[PDB]
Design a protein around this nucleic acid. Structure first.
Lengths: 110, 94, 67, 71
RNA sequence: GAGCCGGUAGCGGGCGUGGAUCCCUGGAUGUCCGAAUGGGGGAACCCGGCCGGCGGGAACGCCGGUCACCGCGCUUUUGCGCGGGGGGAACCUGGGGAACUGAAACAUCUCAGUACCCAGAGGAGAGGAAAGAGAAAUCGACUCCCUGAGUAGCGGCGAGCGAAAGGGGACCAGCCUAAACCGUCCGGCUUGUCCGGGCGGGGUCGUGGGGCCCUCGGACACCGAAUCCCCAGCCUAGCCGAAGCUGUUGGGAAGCAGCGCCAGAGAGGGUGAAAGCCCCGUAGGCGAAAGGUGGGGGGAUAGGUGAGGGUACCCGAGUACCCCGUGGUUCGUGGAGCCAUGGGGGAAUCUGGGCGGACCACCGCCUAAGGCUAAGUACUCCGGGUGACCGAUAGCGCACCAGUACCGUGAGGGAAAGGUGAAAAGAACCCCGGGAGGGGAGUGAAAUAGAGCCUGAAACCGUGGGCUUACAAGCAGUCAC
RNA sequence: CAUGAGUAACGAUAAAGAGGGUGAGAAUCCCUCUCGCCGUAAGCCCAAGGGUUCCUACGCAAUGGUCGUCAGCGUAGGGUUAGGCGGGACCUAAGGUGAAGCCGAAAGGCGUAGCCGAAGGGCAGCCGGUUAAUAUUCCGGCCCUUCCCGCAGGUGCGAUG
RNA sequence: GCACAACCUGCGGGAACCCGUACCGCAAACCGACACAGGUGGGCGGGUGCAAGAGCACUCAGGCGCGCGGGAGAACCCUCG
C-alpha cells in the first residue's frame, strides 16, 4: 500500500472479509491501494433525480477498501509474489511465482 | 511569443446590437495597444478596422468557503467595420 | 503525437514559422469555440496548446543550434 | 572614508581622561575622568606637471612628497 | 510498472503496455516588479534614442535584439574586453559603541567590549613559521579541548575581576616577495656611470644573498585547487527479500483453539478489536546510472625547490627608537614591562637591532617596520536520524488555505479551529412546515457514532417525581428527636 | 456561564392617517390618495476619498440596533469605452534627486547642472437624441486639433543658446 | 545646412497610442472601532415678503418622514407657556 502495489485488474481472494469469494478487481489505485473487487456495495438510494431513473437509487456500489485480500492465485490461492531471474534478453517478468504460478500473461486472461 | 491571437469575443448582450449593425465588441488581451487592436483586427478577420475603443474590468465579490476573493482581469475593447463585413458566422451566431 | 515530434524534427525556418503560427490560429478557433461544440473539444485545446508549445521548443532547438 | 591620510592610515579612535596625581610623591591617584575623543594630522600640496595638488597628511606627507618629487 | 489529467471527488471530455502517472539530471522560452542600471517613477507602471520585422506605408504600435553606474587592467585611439555590486536564520573579523543591576548610596569601579548602528571576506572565516616562549646550556607555527590556581594577581586592594609557559589531547606543509648586486633591458632625464619600470639569479624559514678565486654538480619532492583521469560519496529514481492455513467466539478478527512455518532480517507502522509466517521493496543482505560534486589511492602533469670554503662590502620594508597624549594585557595609574598608535623628535645592514631583569653592568633570546593557504574548536537556513523531550490552553505562537484574521500612521502586534465512521453506505422516500427543522423508512453492530457530528464531566437554564413551606427572625449548620 | 433585567436603552419632538396591492407573514415593501419638515437646505454640481458597488433576476437562515416577502444584505449574470473632458505623451517654484564638486571612523552631511516633481503654467469642441445601467466618451446634427505623405503657392530657411 | 528641396502658407491624401467614467460622495458607502445628530475644499445659491442682505417666516423645483410600534396619560428631570 504505497507508491508501489499488489495485483492490478487481477483476480483474487478475500481472507478476513465477509465474502472470500474472489473475483474481478475492476480498478486499483497507486497510493491509496483503493481497489474495487466488485464484491460488496449498496445503492446510495440516489438523488431522487432523473440523473438515475427519474425514480432513482444507484445500484453498482463497489469501492473496495481493506488490504487483507490474498492477491494472485495460480493453481495456488494465497501466495506472495516472486520477482525475476530474467532468463531472456531484457527480462523483468516480475510475474507471480510461488507454489502454483500466475503472471497475468498478456494472453487468454489478464 | 508573437502568436497574434489575443482575444475572446464579447458574448455580451448589450454589446450585441453593435455587432448587429456596424460595430463589434470583445474581450481582448488586457494590454494590446489600441493600434494593436487595429492590427490583430485587420489581419485576423480580414476587415477594415474603424473606431477602436477600450475599457477594463476586474472582479468583485466572490466568497470562498472559509476565505475569499473576487476574480482576475477581464479586458474590453470595441472596433467597428467600414462596410459591415466580416464576423458573419460569429454574429448570425450570438 | 510522438509522430508530431517527428514532423517537428522535419521542418525549419519559415516552415516551423507559419506552421506554429497557423496552428496557433487553429487554437484561436478553439478560443472562439468557448461556447459551441465544447465537449469533444476539450482536447483540441489542451493538447493543441501542448503541440504548439513543442513547435516553439523546436524553433528554439534549431535556431539556437544556429546562433 | 574621505579623510584618513593618503600616505597610509591615521584616521580614528581615542579613549582618555585623568582626574589627578600625587603618587610616588605623597600618596595614591586622585583617580578619574571617564572621557572620549578624536586625534589627528594636517593638509597640503604641490604639482604633477603644470596643474596639481597633493592633499595627504602631515609627516607621511613631507617624506612622501619628497619621494614622488624624486618621481 | 502498468495506470494518470495536482489538493475536487462534479461536470463535460481524455492519454496511454508501438516503458502512459510519475521519481531524477540536465533542457527552452522563461510576463511585469525587485540590486535594475537605457530614462523616470508614488516598484510590480508610464517614457525614450539603434538594426530587424509586420501592418493601413509616413506618423502608430507590438515581438525582438537593444543603450546604468562603479572601480577594475588592456591598444594613449576599441574606450572593446573584465570586476562588483544584490542577498542570506547563526556562526565570523574589524569598524563605533550604552544605562541599568552590583559595589544594599555612588561619582573610580560595574555589567564590558556585553546589547545595539555599521563595513565586509565565507562557507567558515580567525589566527597561522617566532625581534616567541623560558631559563633547563630547553623548547620549538597557528587554532580548539582538558589542566594549568580562580592561584600568579588587577583594585574607593572594596563588588569584584582573574592570566600566561608548561602538561595531558587533537591536529601536524610549510611556503614565500622589494629587498641593487648581477646582468639584461626599455623609458628615461639628459648621456656616459641617477631614477624609472619589465626578465630574472637574489627572489633570507630558524639567516644569509650577491660579485671574484678553487672543491662543485651528470635520475626520486610534491603543492593551499598548480593539474588531469579515474573506483567519481551522493543527488532522486532500485531490488530482492524468510514461513501457515482449518477452525473458532465475533459486524469484526491479525484474536481463543488446532495443528504446519521463518529466521546473518521479533526495529515499526500499515490490513474493520493486540500477525515473525497478513499490508510494508525494513530491519537480511544486496542495489544499481551516460549528468552535478574529490578527500582518498595512484599515476602523470613536478613551479620550485635540494652542495664548499675564500674575500675590503652593498642588498625586507617609509618611524625602531625616545618626550607626552591613549589602546591592549590578569594591570584601574602605579617602581608598571612587551605589542599597539595620536601628536614632535627622528636611524641602524648580521660588532646589526627589540626582546628575559624600571633601570645599569651580564649571559641568553629572536631575528621585527611585506606577502600565501590549507588541517583539527564555532555556527545553524536546509537533509537524516535518536529522545526516564510534548499531546492539542505544552509543545514553534504556528499540526495545516496562523505570521493570515484582526489594532496601529508607519514602525509594529499578532488569535483561533485538530478527530463523523471501520469503510461513506453520510441519508432516495413518505408525512407539519416559507424555511429551517421535526415523526417515520432505510444505515448499522451504535447514530444518546449523525456533519461540527469521538470521549463528550463541572457551571447555568430547563420537563417530571419525593420530602418540605404563610405568626416567621438564621452563613450556616448541626446534636437530638 | 451567570447578574442586575426581561427594568435602562434604539442615535435627534422634521408627526403622520387611509385605500387597494404582493406576500407563508407585511406598523415597519409597492402604487395611489389625505398630511407635516426641509428649500438655502435635509439643493443639485465638481473634486476627495471609498473602492464595491450600480442595474436586472432570483433568496433571507446572518445583517440592520425586533420587524421585514426591504437593502447599500446573499447568489448569479450584465454594467462604465473620449484626436478634440482630465493627466502623461510638454513647463517649472518651493521642493526631492542628483553627473561635478566640497565634506565622515563607517553608514552620511552638504549639491551646480540636467531630471522628477502642481486643478501654479500651457493645450485642439458643443449641443440634442439612445441604454436596467455609462456619455461633450455612443448616435446624430453642427466646429475644430497637431503629426505624417504628397502636391500648390511662399521665403536667407535653419537652434533653443 | 539651408537653399532646391530647410521654414511660412493652401488643397488633397493619411494619421493620432497610455492610464481614466458605474454609483456614494456636506454624507448611513469619505474620516470617528456602530445605518455613530462630530468634520471635511470651490459652483446661482428658484420665489414671496423684510430698507439691505445665502439671517429671518412660507414656500420653487428637488429632498424627506431620522426606523422599533399602540397606549393611557399620575411622580418627578427634561423642553417650553
Amino acid at each position: 500500500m504505497r507508491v508501489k502495489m499488489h495485483v492490478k485488474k487481477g483476480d483474487t481472494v478475500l481472507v478476513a472479509s465477509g465474502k472470500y469469494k474472489g473475483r474481478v478487481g475492476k480498478v486499483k489505485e497507486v497510493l491509496p491501494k483503493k481497489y474495487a473487487v466488485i464484491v460488496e456495495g449498496v445503492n446510495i438510494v440516489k438523488k431522487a433525480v432523473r440523473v438515475s431513473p427519474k425514480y432513482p437509487q444507484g445500484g453498482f456500489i463497489e469501492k473496495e477498501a481493506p488490504l487483507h485480500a490474498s492477491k494472485v492465485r495460480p493453481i495456488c490461492p494465497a501466495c506472495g509474489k516472486p520477482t525475476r531471474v530474467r532468463k531472456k534478453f531484457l527480462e523483468n517478468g516480475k510475474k507471480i511465482r510461488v507454489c502454483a504460478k500466475c503472471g497475468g500473461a498478456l494472453d487468454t486472461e489478464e | 511569443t508573437a502568436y497574434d491571437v489575443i482575444l475572446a469575443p464579447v458574448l455580451s448582450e448589450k454589446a450585441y446590437a453593435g455587432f448587429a449593425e456596424g460595430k463589434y465588441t470583445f474581450w481582448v488581451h488586457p494590454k494590446a495597444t489600441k493600434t494593436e487592436i487595429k492590427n490583430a483586427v485587420e489581419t485576423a478577420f480580414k476587415v477594415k478596422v474603424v473606431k477602436v475603443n477600450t475599457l477594463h474590468v476586474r472582479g468583485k465579490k466572490k466568497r470562498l468557503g472559509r476565505y475569499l476573493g473576487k476574480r482576475p482581469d477581464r479586458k474590453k475593447a470595441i472596433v467597428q467595420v467600414a462596410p459591415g463585413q466580416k464576423i458573419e458566422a460569429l454574429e448570425g451566431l450570438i | 503525437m510522438r509522430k508530431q515530434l517527428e514532423e517537428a524534427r522535419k521542418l525549419s525556418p519559415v516552415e516551423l514559422e507559419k506552421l506554429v503560427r497557423e496552428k496557433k490560429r487553429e487554437l484561436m478557433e478553439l478560443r472562439f469555440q468557448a461556447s459551441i461544440g465544447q465537449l469533444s473539444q476539450n482536447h483540441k485545446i489542451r493538447d493543441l496548446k501542448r503541440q504548439i508549445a513543442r513547435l516553439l521548443t523546436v524553433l528554439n532547438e534549431k535556431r539556437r543550434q544556429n546562433a | 572614508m574621505k579623510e584618513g591620510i593618503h600616505p597610509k592610515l591615521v584616521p580614528a579612535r581615542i579613549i582618555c581622561g585623568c582626574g589627578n596625581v600625587i603618587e610616588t610623591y605623597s600618596t595614591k591617584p586622585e583617580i578619574y575622568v571617564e572621557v572620549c575623543s578624536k586625534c589627528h594630522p594636517f593638509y597640503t600640496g604641490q604639482q604633477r606637471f603644470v596643474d596639481t595638488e597633493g592633499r595627504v597628511e602631515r609627516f607621511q606627507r613631507r617624506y612622501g612628497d619628497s619621494y614622488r618629487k624624486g618621481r
